[PDB]
Amino acid sequence: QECTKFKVSSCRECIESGPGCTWCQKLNFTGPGDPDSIRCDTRPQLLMRGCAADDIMDPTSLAETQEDHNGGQKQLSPQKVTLYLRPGQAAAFNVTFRRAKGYPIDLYYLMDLSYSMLDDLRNVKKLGGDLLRALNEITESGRIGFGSFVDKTVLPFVNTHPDKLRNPCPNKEKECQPPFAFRHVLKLTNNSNQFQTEVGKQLISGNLDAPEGGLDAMMQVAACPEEIGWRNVTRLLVFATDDGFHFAGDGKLGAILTPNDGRCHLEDNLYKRSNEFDYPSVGQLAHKLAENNIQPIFAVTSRMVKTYEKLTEIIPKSAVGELSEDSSNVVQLIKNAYNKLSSRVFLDHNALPDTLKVTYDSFCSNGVTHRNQPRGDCDGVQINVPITFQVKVTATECIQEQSFVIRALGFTDIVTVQVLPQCECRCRDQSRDRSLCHGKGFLECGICRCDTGYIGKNCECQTQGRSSQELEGSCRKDNNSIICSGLGDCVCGQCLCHTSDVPGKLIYGQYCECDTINCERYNGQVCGGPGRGLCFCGKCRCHPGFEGSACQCERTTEGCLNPRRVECSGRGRCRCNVCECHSGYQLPLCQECPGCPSPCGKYISCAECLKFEKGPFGKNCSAACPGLQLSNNPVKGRTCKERDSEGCWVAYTLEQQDGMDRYLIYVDESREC
Amino acid sequence: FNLDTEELTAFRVDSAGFGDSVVQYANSWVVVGAPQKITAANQTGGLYQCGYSTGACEPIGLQVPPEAVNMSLGLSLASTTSPSQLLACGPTVHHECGRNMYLTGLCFLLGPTQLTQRLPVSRQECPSSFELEMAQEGFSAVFTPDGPVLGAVGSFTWSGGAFLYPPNMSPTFINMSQENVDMRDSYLGYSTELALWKGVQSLVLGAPRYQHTGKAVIFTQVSRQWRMKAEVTGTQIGSYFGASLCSVDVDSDGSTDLVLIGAPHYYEQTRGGQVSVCPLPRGWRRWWCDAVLYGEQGHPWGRFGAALTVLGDVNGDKLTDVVIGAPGEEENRGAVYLFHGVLGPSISPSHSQRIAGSQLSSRLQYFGQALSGGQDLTQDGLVDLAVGARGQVLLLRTRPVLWVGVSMQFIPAEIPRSAFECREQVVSEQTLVQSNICLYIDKRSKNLLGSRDLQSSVTLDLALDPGRLSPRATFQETKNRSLSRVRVLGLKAHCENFNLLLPSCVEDSVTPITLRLNFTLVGKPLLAFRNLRPMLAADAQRYFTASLPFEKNCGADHICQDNLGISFSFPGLKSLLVGSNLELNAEVMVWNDGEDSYGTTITFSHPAGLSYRYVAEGQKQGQLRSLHLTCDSAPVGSQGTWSTSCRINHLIFRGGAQITFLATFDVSPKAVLGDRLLLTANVSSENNTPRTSKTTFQLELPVKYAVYTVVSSHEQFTKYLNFSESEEKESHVAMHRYQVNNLGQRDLPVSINFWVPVELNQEAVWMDVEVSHPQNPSLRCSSEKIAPPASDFLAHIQKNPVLDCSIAGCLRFRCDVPSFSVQEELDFTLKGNLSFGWVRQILQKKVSVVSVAEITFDTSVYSQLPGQEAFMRAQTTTVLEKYK
Numbered sequence A: 001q002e003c004t005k006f007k008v009s010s011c012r013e014c015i016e017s018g019p020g021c022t023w024c025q026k027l028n029f030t031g032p033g034d035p036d037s038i039r040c041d042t043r044p045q046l047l048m049r050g051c052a053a054d055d056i057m058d059p060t061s062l063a064e065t066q067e068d069h070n071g072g073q074k075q076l077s078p079q080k081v082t083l084y085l086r087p088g089q090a091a092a093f094n095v096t097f098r099r100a101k102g103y104p105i106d107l108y109y110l111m112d113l114s115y116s117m118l119d120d121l122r123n124v125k126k127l128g129g130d131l132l133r134a135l136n137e138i139t140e141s142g143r144i145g146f147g148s149f150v151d152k153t154v155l156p157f158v159n160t161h162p163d164k165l166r167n168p169c170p171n172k173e174k175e176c177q178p179p180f181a182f183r184h185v186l187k188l189t190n191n192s193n194q195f196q197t198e199v200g201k202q203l204i205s206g207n208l209d210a211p212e213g214g215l216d217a218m219m220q221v222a223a224c225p226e227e228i229g230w231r232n233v234t235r236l237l238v239f240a241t242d243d244g245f246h247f248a249g250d251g252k253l254g255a256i257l258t259p260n261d262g263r264c265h266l267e268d269n270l271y272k273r274s275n276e277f278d279y280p281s282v283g284q285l286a287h288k289l290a291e292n293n294i295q296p297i298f299a300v301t302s303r304m305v306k307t308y309e310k311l312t313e314i315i316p317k318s319a320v321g322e323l324s325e326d327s328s329n330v331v332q333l334i335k336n337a338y339n340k341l342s343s344r345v346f347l348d349h350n351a352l353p354d355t356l357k358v359t360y361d362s363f364c365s366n367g368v369t370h371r372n373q374p375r376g377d378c379d380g381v382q383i384n385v386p387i388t389f390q391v392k393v394t395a396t397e398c399i400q401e402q403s404f405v406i407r408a409l410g411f412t413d414i415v416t417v418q419v420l421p422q423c424e425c426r427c428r429d430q431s432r433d434r435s436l437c438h439g440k441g442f443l444e445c446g447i448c449r450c451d452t453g454y455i456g457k458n459c460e461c462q463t464q465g466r467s468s469q470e471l472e473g474s475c476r477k478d479n480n481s482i483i484c485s486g487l488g489d490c491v492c493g494q495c496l497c498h499t500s501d502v503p504g505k506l507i508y509g510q511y512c513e514c515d516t517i518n519c520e521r522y523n524g525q526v527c528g529g530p531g532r533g534l535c536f537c538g539k540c541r542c543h544p545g546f547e548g549s550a551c552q553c554e555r556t557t558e559g560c561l562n563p564r565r566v567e568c569s570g571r572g573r574c575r576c577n578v579c580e581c582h583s584g585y586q587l588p589l590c591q592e593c594p595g596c597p598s599p600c601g602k603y604i605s606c607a608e609c610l611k612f613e614k615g616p617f618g619k620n621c622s623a624a625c626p627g628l629q630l631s632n633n634p635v636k637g638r639t640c641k642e643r644d645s646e647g648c649w650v651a652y653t654l655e656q657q658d659g660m661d662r663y664l665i666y667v668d669e670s671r672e673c
Numbered sequence B: 001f002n003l004d005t006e007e008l009t010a011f012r013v014d015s016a017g018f019g020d021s022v023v024q025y026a027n028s029w030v031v032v033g034a035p036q037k038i039t040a041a042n043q044t045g046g047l048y049q050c051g052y053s054t055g056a057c058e059p060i061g062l063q064v065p066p067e068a069v070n071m072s073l074g075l076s077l078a079s080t081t082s083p084s085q086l087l088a089c090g091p092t093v094h095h096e097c098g099r100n101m102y103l104t105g106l107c108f109l110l111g112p113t114q115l116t117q118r119l120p121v122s123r124q125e126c127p128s129s130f131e132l133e134m135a136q137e138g139f140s141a142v143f144t145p146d147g148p149v150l151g152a153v154g155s156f157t158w159s160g161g162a163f164l165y166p167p168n169m170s171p172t173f174i175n176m177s178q179e180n181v182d183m184r185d186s187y188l189g190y191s192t193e194l195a196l197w198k199g200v201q202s203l204v205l206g207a208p209r210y211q212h213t214g215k216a217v218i219f220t221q222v223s224r225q226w227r228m229k230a231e232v233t234g235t236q237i238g239s240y241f242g243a244s245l246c247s248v249d250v251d252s253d254g255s256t257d258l259v260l261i262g263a264p265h266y267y268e269q270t271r272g273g274q275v276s277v278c279p280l281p282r283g284w285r286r287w288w289c290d291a292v293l294y295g296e297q298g299h300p301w302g303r304f305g306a307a308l309t310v311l312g313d314v315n316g317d318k319l320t321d322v323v324i325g326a327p328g329e330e331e332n333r334g335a336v337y338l339f340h341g342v343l344g345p346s347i348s349p350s351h352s353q354r355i356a357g358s359q360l361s362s363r364l365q366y367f368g369q370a371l372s373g374g375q376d377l378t379q380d381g382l383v384d385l386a387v388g389a390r391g392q393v394l395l396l397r398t399r400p401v402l403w404v405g406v407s408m409q410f411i412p413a414e415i416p417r418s419a420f421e422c423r424e425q426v427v428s429e430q431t432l433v434q435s436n437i438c439l440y441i442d443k444r445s446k447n448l449l450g451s452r453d454l455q456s457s458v459t460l461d462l463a464l465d466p467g468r469l470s471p472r473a474t475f476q477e478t479k480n481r482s483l484s485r486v487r488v489l490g491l492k493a494h495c496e497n498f499n500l501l502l503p504s505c506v507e508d509s510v511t512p513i514t515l516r517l518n519f520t521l522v523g524k525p526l527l528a529f530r531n532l533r534p535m536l537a538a539d540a541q542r543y544f545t546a547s548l549p550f551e552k553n554c555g556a557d558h559i560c561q562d563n564l565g566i567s568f569s570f571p572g573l574k575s576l577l578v579g580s581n582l583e584l585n586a587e588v589m590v591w592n593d594g595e596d597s598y599g600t601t602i603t604f605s606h607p608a609g610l611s612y613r614y615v616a617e618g619q620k621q622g623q624l625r626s627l628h629l630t631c632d633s634a635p636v637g638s639q640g641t642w643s644t645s646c647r648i649n650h651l652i653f654r655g656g657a658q659i660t661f662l663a664t665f666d667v668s669p670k671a672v673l674g675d676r677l678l679l680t681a682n683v684s685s686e687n688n689t690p691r692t693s694k695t696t697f698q699l700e701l702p703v704k705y706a707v708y709t710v711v712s713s714h715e716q717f718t719k720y721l722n723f724s725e726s727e728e729k730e731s732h733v734a735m736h737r738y739q740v741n742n743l744g745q746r747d748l749p750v751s752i753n754f755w756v757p758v759e760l761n762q763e764a765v766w767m768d769v770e771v772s773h774p775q776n777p778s779l780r781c782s783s784e785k786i787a788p789p790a791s792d793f794l795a796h797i798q799k800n801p802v803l804d805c806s807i808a809g810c811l812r813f814r815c816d817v818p819s820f821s822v823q824e825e826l827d828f829t830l831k832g833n834l835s836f837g838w839v840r841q842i843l844q845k846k847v848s849v850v851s852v853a854e855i856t857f858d859t860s861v862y863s864q865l866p867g868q869e870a871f872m873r874a875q876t877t878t879v880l881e882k883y884k
């Protein structure tokens, strides 16, 4: 299949050459004066040479599935995978996950208290008897908590002085509460009516800047339940605001350059740190939040629906809920919560060391046959229908024994996956044949590994003073080749490549022909530096995810993809994260052809064949006019305005899209004769 | 890779928010910021100037008006060099308008002049909606030849902008209009930077929160325009794409080449951070922050891209280098990075240095928040860097990087066979070979003449046949197989030859004896401590080896004739223009009609514009190259040319056998070389060239160059047909406007040709047609009439109503052009009263007359790149449909 010889001293050093590398233990396999590295070829070649089939060693990766009794863990099995991983070779172990049901719930209502959230506070101040009612079906005795929030106390987020601070309420001043940011009004409790009444109590407030500072509240909530308290089972939150959201960096406005620590420090169920403290970064939640098994449920105006939509992409376990400005259909949010919140099955892992690389597979229940990708995104599984993730762990070198975990984001079930550096092959000892190797060496699967000072395929020679005549037979590749290809002095038939104390430099081979320095370069680096690929006798063996003569096409990925997720839009192969746009179409993703004339000609005939019905001329239309779309909307971009078949000026824009002659038109409902 | 991490200066002035924002003042001083240095009643902060002479910071005098309150100045800083000035700012002024106060911002201009204050100090009186109440102008500032520029954030719907101040003339301002519906709450102007050019200046503002993701927008200030050039959305939500920005100069041409961007809070799997490189394409409505790359690091929650500044040429390879902060690295500890340019729009993802907060920074939490460098302040020659940190601010100088060239030779070229096979009655007469090595430093521009740039001590370490445990010789001075001696270098060579002793009798003779040197920079004491530590560059081939061949025994006689020939060609090579045909495939064949050549070498001569790259082909081919060979490029000729030798490394070339291999030379898209490029091929054996007439093989090729030349028919074109046609009038003059432009990369003369119909069987089509050339000098154009083939035009246009020049006596206009500079959109139009008389001549209606416009240029020397683009031949078809 494939096997290039690295320095081969033992059966193990033949293994460290590549996947398609096999080794032969059968003794007397070395000819009168043949190299010991010949024992390391491909399985096919070995049989063609004579090497027996049962003599072909091939130490392989496999998986140990030590399954538990039961109740150990619930729907993440196996529970303990002790893999024996050989470098370069992938070990595969499956993961059965059949979610069951619903555990003890624990909600928390993060509501923005602004003057815009007035009729929201009214139509919501006490509708919690239907929440436990909506909780009754699936889960049983859950918990209910509340937390208010507005925006940082200090400006520029809201006027800090003066007594409009005591009275922010615009115009009405109905005794609204002082400007705040996070007030833990209610703790997680069983009761429901006590919860409702403790809410209506507090009234709204107000601030200056339009977007809110609700992000600071997020952390402070799930930061120290040593004062807020939280169930050890489930924890769902729900964001609610008819306004934006401020993240890290914005704090520099308020003269505060102290970043977010992560822990809340309140003394009266009320923040007094957010002022001397900067906003939680956008990504400081998907970590801390998902660490405490908490998951917000976006539910805001339709004005802020597609902004939290992009936020759903990033952070895990989060749904989008477009609702009216009255927060009346707020309870239907959770009918849509479990809908696709008990659907996002995740399967990530603790940040593994760089010396390892992990991947997964996916076999969703409804049709999907995915393969090879991190995560376990299957948004098509709910209650009692198992799934399948094929975890494939590979190493680059002989790792040191360690252990990591593969958790499901938003789940307490830890799977302690043990990892064992498997890098050996095992035969015999030095009680058998202290004779051969002339006493100064031991034997292992045929060949003999000599001492520090003895060398040779039988520990016969010494590194001080040897040669013969026709021992130089297999010491040169051919009769017209220099001995040991230079850079190597022949001893006892074989060659001992010389050594260079130069970074990277290394000679090797029977005749010392191959080096690990003289290959194809890239970006002023050998085979693309140590990162991309490596060098081995001219050809570059690029690391995984990199191909090309010298890893020149660095990435096998496709940054050639746009948000449309179609490569290079209209035309252009995706070579090395670059597009080869046809015609004058320009980079990066081939959409704008700056030089293209702007053909409205030849399009008039079809423009009056779609909007107007003035006779598909040449033939019919929808055939001679593959500009199939004619949206009933104000599209724009290529503002065209030419004439019709007979006199009248027919106006119409022309928004092209993606590939070749594909278009999208809106022909003005008007003419001019 | 030369940022001092030992002997530096540290200013630890404990003043609250001290060392939170810093800038390079006039070269002599560095200004730090302490916004939270409480003064009076919840008022300003204060500034501090620090000098190198004495490690101490002196307060700076300021007339803080009672008007400006809680402005916490110093938060935003900025300095120019033009004349040396500085700009400090309180971006948090509080003015009480009763019901509610707001934030205006107040800045101060200092220097060796008048202490100006310039919003300017029209204390901004009091007045959903907003206008300019909480715009905190001066939040970020940067200078420019035509007056400073401060940035507002809360402009209107917190859209943003930047107030430009001219020379005592009333200031202007640039928002994004209101017609721009979006951009609500984006802090446009959070960060600001210049973008000078060979032409007019260009500003840039950072909008961290455009649609809550982050976009960066670039603006131009054309005469009576001040519109937008272009922009680029963010990559991810919350990424904060727009935080930091830095226009940097990959080279030193003085025109800003590219622009960096910040997004400390970005990720996909690791939240290290994100900086984005985004060159500055010219030609609005197109601009990509994706000239590929974007620097990062393998450490989550690092805030990488928090700040950054142009540092300039530090390593002296003509390639400016930049610095980037990341105060979130490690356990909240600080961090900084160093990158280098390459060629034009690009940087090197792999950084050379990563000085972090682990550098016996005893105990500072986050460092690198901000930083600005490029100025020589310690007055030791080369530039310096200033990086602010919580509590204190540090200065890292740039250690001199010199590199040296070396020459190796063996006085006795080869070995005379005298002390070769030897004999055993009487002696070892050990032959005496001499090996002379020389050392000289050449690339010096930065360090300049004088102390340091000259004197240095060095340790030398010569060693023969290292890789083998069979020393083929020894030096006499020490008697060992190697030796070392510390000797003084200079910009002027230093040559010393050493004595070598070859034993009369030896086994291996075929393999020349190698001699390599390990050399470095020992001691590093040089006069004063104003150099401290010099060092070498990245590409330090400190291991240089030279070979000594032997007089190979070609028999007990026969004299050993060295006879080798050589000949090469270029398979399929057609025309070779610079741009296409980057790789250059050479098929070299070679002979051996004499004695066996062992270490046969084959060297080429070529213009600077190319070098050799390993082919490494496999897969498969052919009757053909098989061949591991070692090649070493190197500069030779007086000025321009240089040789790339290539010795067939490890095997023999025997008998009258011929062999063919493939050697490819990459050629640069900007290859400076004559209208013709020649190249040769010296061929010889390992045993050198013992005799007279060299066997060199050369050939000379015509060279051309790539160019992008395009032309369109502007949509201001007269298609005017209409039914009112009672008589045969004259003047409804039509207007064919043609716009042209070249996206090539070289200034090149051109000549734009035209074709406008007129005479048509004595019946003029449209008369007195001339061509205007607005927005450009009065150029000279030619005029010539010509008569078409004269076919039956009756049936001709009956096919197609068109009226090309092939029917009606056309008119060619040859508008020559001195030098069509690249990027120049030189455009112009042509008009003439269009007669209605000829319309009847052909007896039809709805006819249409066409003009063809085709650009040309010397087919030789220049040529269009992609294959073949007809983008240099536009067309405009007007219609004369007039009925009744």
Ligand SMILES: *[C@@H]1O[C@H](CO)[C@@H](O[C@@H]2O[C@H](CO)[C@@H](O[C@@H]3O[C@H](CO[C@H]4O[C@H](CO)[C@@H](O)[C@H](O)[C@@H]4O)[C@@H](O)[C@H](O[C@H]4O[C@H](CO)[C@@H](O)[C@H](O)[C@@H]4O)[C@@H]3O)[C@H](O)[C@H]2NC(C)=O)[C@H](O)[C@H]1NC(C)=O
Pocket: B129, B156, B157, B159, B175, B176, B177, B178, B179
């Ligand atoms: C920079 O960016 C801004 C905003 O992005 C661009 O648009 C300006 O936006 C404001 C929006 O409010 C436009 O409105 C102006 O309102 C001022 C005062 O408020 C009036 O309108 C509000 C809301 O209707 C009422 O509640 C209030 O009672 C007022 O009626 C007016 O003073 C502005 O001036 C207008 O009338 C004056 C009369 O003196 C005329 O001189 C002006 O031309 C104008 O008609 C205005 O009505 C404002 O129009 C926008 N400015 C401009 C210049 O168009 C800006 O365009 C942009 N600036 C630049 C220079 O490009």
Ligand SMILES: *[C@@H]1O[C@H](CO)[C@@H](O[C@@H]2O[C@H](CO)[C@@H](O[C@@H]3O[C@H](CO)[C@@H](O)[C@H](O)[C@@H]3O)[C@H](O)[C@H]2NC(C)=O)[C@H](O)[C@H]1NC(C)=O
Pocket: A501, B459, B460, B461, B518, B519, B520
């Ligand atoms: C030229 O090169 C050679 C070899 O590279 C230098 O010889 C000695 O080489 C060794 C590396 O094999 C140096 O490293 C030693 O390494 C350990 C760490 O691995 C370190 O603890 C020791 O302090 C030592 O550095 C060794 O330094 C080096 N010898 C000396 C005297 O520095 C040779 O020195 C080089 N020629 C010079 C310096 O002129």
Ligand SMILES: *[C@@H]1O[C@H](CO)[C@@H](O[C@@H]2O[C@H](CO)[C@@H](O[C@@H]3O[C@H](CO)[C@@H](O)[C@H](O)[C@@H]3O)[C@H](O)[C@H]2NC(C)=O)[C@H](O)[C@H]1NC(C)=O
Pocket: B603, B605, B636, B637, B643, B682, B683, B684, B689, B694
């Ligand atoms: C094959 O070619 C190269 C260059 O042609 C030889 O390298 C050295 O080249 C230089 C010229 O750059 C020779 O120096 C002199 O050239 C100048 C004119 O430019 C002339 O004034 C001098 O009289 C001399 O010719 C130099 O001699 C030559 N090096 C050697 C060792 O001779 C190279 O030598 C050639 N390869 C061989 C001979 O194997």
Ligand SMILES: *[C@@H]1O[C@H](CO)[C@@H](O[C@@H]2O[C@H](CO)[C@@H](O)[C@H](O)[C@H]2NC(C)=O)[C@H](O)[C@H]1NC(C)=O
Pocket: B040, B041, B042
């Ligand atoms: C500036 O204002 C701050 C409050 O914004 C003052 O800080 C304290 O504020 C509380 C609450 O109003 C007062 O009760 C304290 O008396 C203030 N502390 C002190 C020590 O006075 C702060 O004092 C003000 N600074 C100045 C000097 O005007």
Ligand SMILES: *[C@@H]1O[C@H](CO)[C@@H](O)[C@H](O)[C@H]1NC(C)=O
Pocket: A092, A093, A094, A388, A390
């Ligand atoms: C895992 O599942 C796949 C698909 O069902 C199956 O083909 C494979 O054999 C399984 N792997 C293991 C280790 O059982």
Ligand SMILES: *[C@@H]1O[C@H](CO)[C@@H](O)[C@H](O)[C@H]1NC(C)=O
Pocket: A478, A479, A480
């Ligand atoms: C050795 O190499 C080749 C390939 O088999 C052959 O053509 C030739 O005659 C051989 N040389 C000797 C001297 O045996």
Ligand SMILES: *[C@@H]1O[C@H](CO)[C@@H](O)[C@H](O)[C@H]1NC(C)=O
Pocket: B478, B480, B481, B482, B483
């Ligand atoms: C002499 O040679 C030995 C062995 O090669 C070497 O280790 C030693 O450094 C040399 N001594 C001197 C004085 O150069």
Ligand SMILES: [Ca+2]
Pocket: A116, A117, A118, A119, A120, A242, A325, A326
């Ligand atoms: Ca509401």
Ligand SMILES: [Ca+2]
Pocket: B248, B249, B250, B251, B252, B253, B254, B255, B256, B257, B258
């Ligand atoms: Ca530049």
Ligand SMILES: [Ca+2]
Pocket: B312, B313, B314, B315, B316, B317, B318, B319, B320, B321
């Ligand atoms: Ca440089």
Ligand SMILES: [Ca+2]
Pocket: B375, B376, B377, B378, B379, B380, B381, B382, B383, B384, B397
């Ligand atoms: Ca300096």
